[PDB]
Amino acid sequence: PQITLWQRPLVTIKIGGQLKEALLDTGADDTVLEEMSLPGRWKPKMIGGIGGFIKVRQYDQIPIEICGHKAIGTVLVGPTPTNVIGRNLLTQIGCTLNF
Amino acid sequence: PQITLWQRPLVTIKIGGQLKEALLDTGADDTVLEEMSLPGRWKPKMIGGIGGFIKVRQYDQIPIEICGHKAIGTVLVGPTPTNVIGRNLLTQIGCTLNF
């Protein structure tokens, strides 16, 4: 579908069998999610945002649906006011910018 | 044209008689640029991104040339580690997300 930007591009995602609201963010290299439970082991990562750096838990090869589109990739769990879907997953669903 | 997201969507804009590189960011409500001078009135505010909040100066009705388009919008000026073009300006050039 085509999503205009007059409002925040919030969509529904599904991860771990649960539905959550997330923001499609072309300015993010990675996908950052609010605290939640994920399987397996995690690795450390330090990411930088507009306000500074934060530590997150990196989980790999995690199944996740975005607007009904299936993806499997890396998700980072840490302190954020909203779930952010970055380019690592936007490319998996074939998302592009157009004008 | 169509912009894929395999790489960061960087563009060159013209503002205040200056040329700056900026990231097309669908997650940003408004454009945020590193310290620079802008004419007109402004009001201070705090924006909270990943890593915490930063203080910025909000300028409205600022002329900006982007992707061959002469648009007008709001610009937040402050200590951001990266320049980003937000929805406030992206809408004016008819930019949309598609997948």
Ligand SMILES: COC(=O)N[C@H](C(=O)NN(CCC[C@@]1(Cc2ccccc2)C(=O)N([C@H]2c3ccccc3C[C@H]2O)C[C@H]1O)Cc1ccc(-c2ccncc2)cc1)C(C)(C)C
């Ligand atoms: C390479 O790094 C990244 O891609 N980082 C991601 C990120 O923040 N990307 N920024 C781009 C994305 C910004 C949003 C992320 C967001 C955060 C919380 C809740 C919802 C959305 C951000 O900070 N936003 C805030 C914003 C902006 C304008 C006006 C108001 C407000 C309030 C917030 O919503 C919205 C997005 O634009 C650009 C950027 C690139 C490099 C460095 C860096 C580089 C090197 N050293 C230091 C900093 C700092 C910033 C992230 C999400 C993975 C942390």
